[PDB]
Protein backbone atom coordinates (compact mmCIF):
# COMPACT_ATOMS: atom_id res chain seq x y z
CA UNK A 1 0.00 0.00 0.00
CA UNK A 2 1.67 3.25 -1.20
CA UNK A 3 1.06 6.97 -0.45
CA UNK A 4 -0.15 7.35 -4.10
CA UNK A 5 -2.61 4.43 -3.65
CA UNK A 6 -3.84 6.06 -0.41
CA UNK A 7 -4.33 9.43 -2.25
CA UNK A 8 -6.29 7.71 -5.08
CA UNK A 9 -8.49 5.75 -2.59
CA UNK A 10 -9.17 8.97 -0.59
CA UNK A 11 -10.32 10.76 -3.79
CA UNK A 12 -12.51 7.78 -4.84
CA UNK A 13 -14.20 7.81 -1.39
CA UNK A 14 -14.31 11.61 -0.74
CA UNK A 15 -14.78 13.33 -4.12
CA UNK A 16 -17.72 13.26 -6.58
CA UNK A 17 -17.17 11.14 -9.73
CA UNK A 18 -16.91 13.32 -12.85
CA UNK A 19 -16.29 16.47 -10.76
CA UNK A 20 -12.65 17.62 -11.29
CA UNK A 21 -13.01 20.44 -8.72
CA UNK A 22 -14.01 17.97 -5.94
CA UNK A 23 -11.04 15.71 -6.99
CA UNK A 24 -8.54 18.63 -6.53
CA UNK A 25 -10.11 19.59 -3.14
CA UNK A 26 -9.96 15.90 -1.98
CA UNK A 27 -6.24 15.67 -2.96
CA UNK A 28 -5.42 18.98 -1.21
CA UNK A 29 -7.37 17.98 1.94
CA UNK A 30 -5.58 14.57 2.12
CA UNK A 31 -2.16 16.17 1.64
CA UNK A 32 -2.82 18.93 4.19
CA UNK A 33 -4.33 16.68 6.89
CA UNK A 34 -2.62 13.27 6.38
CA UNK A 35 0.54 13.03 4.25
CA UNK A 36 2.45 15.62 2.25
CA UNK A 37 2.85 14.76 -1.48
CA UNK A 38 4.56 16.44 -4.44
CA UNK A 39 1.34 17.61 -6.21
CA UNK A 40 1.58 21.19 -7.52
CA UNK A 41 -0.94 22.11 -4.79
CA UNK A 42 -3.61 24.78 -4.50
CA UNK A 43 -1.36 27.89 -4.14
CA UNK A 44 0.60 27.30 -7.39
CA UNK A 45 -2.50 25.59 -8.86
CA UNK A 46 -4.33 28.95 -8.72
CA UNK A 47 -1.45 30.57 -10.70
CA UNK A 48 -1.59 27.64 -13.24
CA UNK A 49 -5.38 28.21 -13.64
CA UNK A 50 -4.82 31.96 -14.31
CA UNK A 51 -2.17 31.04 -16.97
CA UNK A 52 -4.31 28.30 -18.61
CA UNK A 53 -7.27 30.76 -18.78
CA UNK A 54 -5.17 33.49 -20.41
CA UNK A 55 -3.76 31.32 -23.25
CA UNK A 56 -6.59 28.72 -23.71
CA UNK A 57 -4.00 26.25 -25.17
CA UNK A 58 -5.24 23.62 -27.66
CA UNK A 59 -2.35 21.20 -27.10
CA UNK A 60 -0.47 20.99 -23.78
CA UNK A 61 2.51 18.79 -22.97
CA UNK A 62 3.13 17.93 -19.26
CA UNK A 63 6.50 16.45 -18.14
CA UNK A 64 5.79 14.55 -14.92
CA UNK A 65 2.25 13.42 -14.00
CA UNK A 66 2.74 11.97 -10.48
CA UNK A 67 -0.91 11.30 -9.28
CA UNK A 68 -2.57 13.37 -12.01
CA UNK A 69 -3.24 16.44 -9.81
CA UNK A 70 -1.85 18.98 -12.35
CA UNK A 71 -3.34 17.00 -15.33
CA UNK A 72 -6.85 17.31 -13.69
CA UNK A 73 -6.15 21.01 -12.88
CA UNK A 74 -5.19 21.80 -16.52
CA UNK A 75 -7.60 19.38 -18.32
CA UNK A 76 -10.68 20.67 -16.47
CA UNK A 77 -10.00 24.16 -18.02
CA UNK A 78 -9.24 23.13 -21.60
CA UNK A 79 -11.74 24.00 -24.35
CA UNK A 80 -13.80 21.21 -26.07
CA UNK A 81 -11.41 19.29 -28.35
CA UNK A 82 -8.22 20.66 -26.66
CA UNK A 83 -5.76 17.96 -25.52
CA UNK A 84 -3.16 17.19 -22.88
CA UNK A 85 -0.26 14.76 -23.32
CA UNK A 86 1.35 13.84 -19.99
CA UNK A 87 4.73 12.04 -19.75
CA UNK A 88 5.28 9.77 -16.74
CA UNK A 89 8.43 7.61 -16.27
CA UNK A 90 7.11 5.74 -13.17
CA UNK A 91 4.58 3.03 -14.24
CA UNK A 92 3.03 2.93 -10.74
CA UNK A 93 2.41 6.72 -10.89
CA UNK A 94 1.14 6.40 -14.50
CA UNK A 95 -1.56 3.86 -13.34
CA UNK A 96 -2.58 6.22 -10.44
CA UNK A 97 -2.77 9.17 -12.91
CA UNK A 98 -4.98 7.20 -15.35
CA UNK A 99 -7.32 6.21 -12.48
CA UNK A 100 -7.41 9.81 -11.20
CA UNK A 101 -8.29 11.08 -14.71
CA UNK A 102 -10.92 8.30 -15.08
CA UNK A 103 -12.61 9.23 -11.77
CA UNK A 104 -12.56 12.98 -12.69
CA UNK A 105 -14.17 12.18 -16.10
CA UNK A 106 -11.28 13.78 -18.01
CA UNK A 107 -9.91 10.60 -19.70
CA UNK A 108 -11.04 11.78 -23.21
CA UNK A 109 -8.88 14.93 -22.92
CA UNK A 110 -5.64 13.43 -21.57
CA UNK A 111 -3.18 10.86 -22.91
CA UNK A 112 -0.45 9.37 -20.66
CA UNK A 113 2.91 8.75 -22.36
CA UNK A 114 4.95 6.00 -20.64
CA UNK A 115 8.67 6.58 -20.53
CA UNK A 116 11.49 9.07 -20.16
CA UNK A 117 11.18 12.53 -21.66
CA UNK A 118 14.54 12.19 -23.52
CA UNK A 119 13.10 9.12 -25.32
CA UNK A 120 9.50 10.36 -25.83
CA UNK A 121 10.10 14.02 -26.88
CA UNK A 122 11.71 12.90 -30.26
CA UNK A 123 8.68 10.63 -30.96
CA UNK A 124 6.03 13.36 -30.52
CA UNK A 125 5.86 14.42 -34.19
CA UNK A 126 5.75 11.04 -36.01
CA UNK A 127 4.19 8.84 -33.25
CA UNK A 128 1.76 11.24 -31.55
CA UNK A 129 0.91 13.40 -34.63
CA UNK A 130 2.15 16.59 -32.93
CA UNK A 131 2.94 19.67 -35.06
CA UNK A 132 3.89 22.31 -32.39
CA UNK A 133 2.97 22.61 -28.70
CA UNK A 134 0.88 25.53 -27.34
CA UNK A 135 2.05 25.07 -23.75
CA UNK A 136 4.53 22.92 -21.80
CA UNK A 137 4.19 22.29 -18.04
CA UNK A 138 7.56 21.17 -16.55
CA UNK A 139 7.27 19.21 -13.31
CA UNK A 140 9.69 16.26 -13.72
CA UNK A 141 13.39 15.83 -12.75
CA UNK A 142 14.61 19.33 -11.93
CA UNK A 143 17.94 18.73 -13.71
CA UNK A 144 15.96 17.90 -16.92
CA UNK A 145 14.12 21.25 -17.35
CA UNK A 146 17.01 22.81 -19.29
CA UNK A 147 17.97 19.76 -21.49
CA UNK A 148 14.29 19.06 -22.27
CA UNK A 149 13.63 22.70 -23.21
CA UNK A 150 16.65 22.47 -25.60
CA UNK A 151 15.43 19.07 -26.94
CA UNK A 152 11.87 20.46 -27.55
CA UNK A 153 13.42 23.30 -29.65
CA UNK A 154 15.72 20.83 -31.52
CA UNK A 155 12.68 18.66 -32.41
CA UNK A 156 10.81 21.66 -33.87
CA UNK A 157 8.09 21.35 -31.22
CA UNK A 158 8.21 25.03 -30.10
CA UNK A 159 6.48 27.87 -31.94
CA UNK A 160 6.43 31.65 -31.52
CA UNK A 161 4.22 32.03 -28.44
CA UNK A 162 4.74 28.51 -26.94
CA UNK A 163 4.21 28.97 -23.21
CA UNK A 164 6.60 27.02 -20.96
CA UNK A 165 5.38 26.89 -17.33
CA UNK A 166 7.86 25.37 -14.82
CA UNK A 167 7.11 24.19 -11.28
CA UNK A 168 9.66 24.24 -8.43
CA UNK A 169 12.04 26.86 -9.81
CA UNK A 170 12.90 27.82 -6.16
CA UNK A 171 12.36 24.49 -4.29
CA UNK A 172 13.96 22.04 -5.06
CA UNK A 173 15.04 24.63 -7.67
CA UNK A 174 16.15 24.65 -11.32
CA UNK A 175 19.15 27.09 -11.35
CA UNK A 176 20.48 26.29 -14.86
CA UNK A 177 17.00 26.42 -16.46
CA UNK A 178 16.30 29.84 -14.74
CA UNK A 179 19.72 31.30 -15.73
CA UNK A 180 19.23 30.07 -19.32
CA UNK A 181 15.68 31.25 -20.07
CA UNK A 182 16.14 34.61 -18.30
CA UNK A 183 19.37 35.24 -20.24
CA UNK A 184 18.02 34.13 -23.65
CA UNK A 185 16.55 36.49 -26.30
CA UNK A 186 14.48 33.45 -27.40
CA UNK A 187 12.39 33.65 -24.16
CA UNK A 188 10.22 36.26 -22.47
CA UNK A 189 10.19 35.34 -18.75
CA UNK A 190 7.94 36.05 -15.77
CA UNK A 191 8.38 34.74 -12.24
CA UNK A 192 5.25 33.97 -10.13
CA UNK A 193 6.24 33.87 -6.45
CA UNK A 194 4.20 31.35 -4.43
CA UNK A 195 4.58 28.54 -1.92
CA UNK A 196 5.70 24.95 -1.98
CA UNK A 197 2.65 22.68 -2.02
CA UNK A 198 1.05 22.30 1.45
CA UNK A 199 3.94 24.15 3.15
CA UNK A 200 4.82 27.64 4.42
CA UNK A 201 7.94 27.48 2.18
CA UNK A 202 8.61 29.92 -0.65
CA UNK A 203 8.52 28.42 -4.14
CA UNK A 204 7.44 29.71 -7.54
CA UNK A 205 6.47 29.13 -11.15
CA UNK A 206 8.46 30.46 -14.07
CA UNK A 207 6.63 31.31 -17.30
CA UNK A 208 8.97 31.41 -20.29
CA UNK A 209 7.36 32.29 -23.62
CA UNK A 210 9.28 31.09 -26.69
CA UNK A 211 10.03 33.90 -29.17
CA UNK A 212 11.64 31.86 -31.97
CA UNK A 213 15.36 31.29 -32.76
Ligand SMILES: O=C(NCCCCCn1ccc2cnccc21)c1cc(-c2ccc(F)cc2)cc(O)c1O
Nearest residue numbers: 038063064087088089116117139140141168171172
Ligand atom coordinates in the same frame (compact mmCIF):
# COMPACT_ATOMS: atom_id res chain seq x y z
O1 LIG B 1 10.95 15.92 -7.57
C1 LIG B 1 9.89 16.46 -7.86
N1 LIG B 1 9.25 16.21 -9.01
C2 LIG B 1 9.79 15.26 -9.99
C3 LIG B 1 9.50 13.81 -9.59
C4 LIG B 1 10.23 12.82 -10.49
C5 LIG B 1 9.71 12.91 -11.93
C6 LIG B 1 10.32 11.81 -12.80
N2 LIG B 1 9.76 11.90 -14.14
C7 LIG B 1 8.44 11.95 -14.42
C8 LIG B 1 8.23 11.99 -15.73
C9 LIG B 1 9.54 11.96 -16.35
C10 LIG B 1 9.99 11.97 -17.65
N3 LIG B 1 11.26 11.92 -17.89
C11 LIG B 1 12.16 11.87 -16.93
C12 LIG B 1 11.83 11.87 -15.61
C13 LIG B 1 10.48 11.91 -15.29
C14 LIG B 1 9.30 17.42 -6.90
C15 LIG B 1 9.88 17.51 -5.66
C16 LIG B 1 9.40 18.38 -4.70
C17 LIG B 1 10.03 18.47 -3.35
C18 LIG B 1 10.60 17.36 -2.73
C19 LIG B 1 11.17 17.49 -1.49
C20 LIG B 1 11.18 18.70 -0.83
F1 LIG B 1 11.73 18.85 0.38
C21 LIG B 1 10.60 19.77 -1.45
C22 LIG B 1 10.05 19.68 -2.68
C23 LIG B 1 8.29 19.16 -5.00
C24 LIG B 1 7.70 19.11 -6.25
O2 LIG B 1 6.64 19.90 -6.53
C25 LIG B 1 8.19 18.24 -7.22
O3 LIG B 1 7.61 18.18 -8.43
Ligand SMILES: [K+]
Nearest residue numbers: 039040069070
Ligand atom coordinates in the same frame (compact mmCIF):
# COMPACT_ATOMS: atom_id res chain seq x y z
K1 LIG C 1 0.87 17.46 -9.73
Ligand SMILES: [Mg+2]
Nearest residue numbers: 040139167168
Ligand atom coordinates in the same frame (compact mmCIF):
# COMPACT_ATOMS: atom_id res chain seq x y z
MG1 LIG D 1 6.45 19.99 -8.71
